[PDB]
Amino acid sequence: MGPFDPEEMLFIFTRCMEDNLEDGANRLPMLAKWKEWINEPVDSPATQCFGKCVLVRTGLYDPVAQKFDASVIQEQFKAYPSLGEKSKVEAYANAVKQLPSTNNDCAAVFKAYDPVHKAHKDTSKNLFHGNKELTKGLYEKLGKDIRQKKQSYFEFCENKYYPAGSDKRQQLCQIRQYTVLDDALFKEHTDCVMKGIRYITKDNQLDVEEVKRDFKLVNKDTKALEEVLNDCKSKEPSNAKEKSWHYYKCLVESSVKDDFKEAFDYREVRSQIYAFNLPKNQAYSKPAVMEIDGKQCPQ
Ligand SMILES: [Cl-]
């Protein structure tokens, strides 16, 4: 588990908040605290499950082992020497290592970790891209090489593989209209997108639940999707680097293609603001039915 870059941690925090914030009067007060690494109220099931969510996605809590795991702390510090002081990182890792084996329920996981969170707040916040000043500097260093805050993930990938001002830019006319290109460049670009929206994991595996999540958000049933994906999986290519493209092509050409395009389009919109749904769950409405950088597409 790990290391995680700033975008990866932002994804984790915002996803866990989206899934765990209450839907009533407590929503905004809780959001204001959790955003600032204040895991309160400690007695709230919402806070407890939020905390467990973050710990599971980072690998600090291993739900299979039913124990905490400090390995990610060392992986994180190795990747980001500027974000920790060795003695402090070691003290934090030690505190995690010495936590007892803990049941895989929100309350138990949260209660066990909370003392560590508080005793090592700055250490953990700095290391895992929660320090606003440090993270701003890292985003500047990375520039075009990482998806930036408030940037469409699709645009991040497009700009990497089909850069503005290049003879490649024109291909976006076809790409944005769901034309499935066959070349190595497009396969890499599609890997960038599919991994960026988490349809494909870091180890090139399909995450059916993530695709389903996006169907449900556009009010589409997922039974037909699951059947299509099962068929696509039965014909999965053996070369790891082609798996993202394989699933993209399969979905685009399948009997769920229209629902897929609708779901994928809305995911692109939501990828522009990771906190899209946090102040309040936003209602989805199908956009009314092309230009690239102001230039008219010939198709
Ligand atoms: Cl964002």
UniProtKB/Swiss-Prot annotation:
Positions annotated to bind noradrenaline: E158, R176, H189, D265, E268
Function field: Modulates blood feeding of female mosquitoes on vertebrate species by binding and sequestering different mediators involved in the host response, such as biogenic amines and eicosanoids. Binds serotonin, histamine, leukotriene B4, leukotriene C4, leukotriene D4, leukotriene E4, adrenaline and noradrenaline. Does not bind tryptamine and U-46619, a stable analog of thromboxane A2. Exhibits vasodilating activity. Inhibits agonist-induced platelet aggregation but not blood clotting. Inhibits noradrenaline-induced smooth muscle contraction. (Microbial infection) Probably promotes Plasmodium gallinaceum oocyst development in mosquito midgut.
Family label: Belongs to the PBP/GOBP family.
Listed InterPro entries: PBP/GOBP, PBP_GOBP_sf
GO terms classed as biological process: regulation of defense response to virus; sensory perception of smell; vasodilation
Binding residues for leukotriene E4: W37, G130, K149
Lineage, highest ranks first: Eukaryota, Metazoa, Ecdysozoa, Arthropoda, Hexapoda
Annotated Pfam families: PBP_GOBP
Tissues in which the UniProt entry reports expression: Saliva (at protein level). Female salivary gland (at protein level). Detected in the head and thorax of the female mosquitoes, where the salivary glands are located. Expressed in the distal-lateral and medial lobes of the female salivary gland but not in the carcass. No or low-level expression in the adult male mosquito tissues.
Record's keyword terms, sorted: Allergen, Antiviral protein, Disulfide bond, Hemostasis impairing toxin, Platelet aggregation inhibiting toxin, Secreted, Signal, Toxin, Vasoactive, Vasodilator
Gene Ontology cellular component list: extracellular space
GO MF: IgE binding; odorant binding; toxin activity
Highest taxon in the source lineage: Eukaryota
CDD domains: PBP_GOBP
Induction: (Microbial infection) Up-regulated during dengue virus type 2 infection (at protein level).
Description of its domains: Lipids and biogenic amines bind independently through different binding pockets, with lipids binding to the N-terminal pocket and biogenic amines to the C-terminal pocket.
Quaternary structure and interacting proteins, as annotated: (Microbial infection) Interacts with envelope protein of dengue virus type 2.
Protein name as it appears in the record: Long form salivary protein D7L1
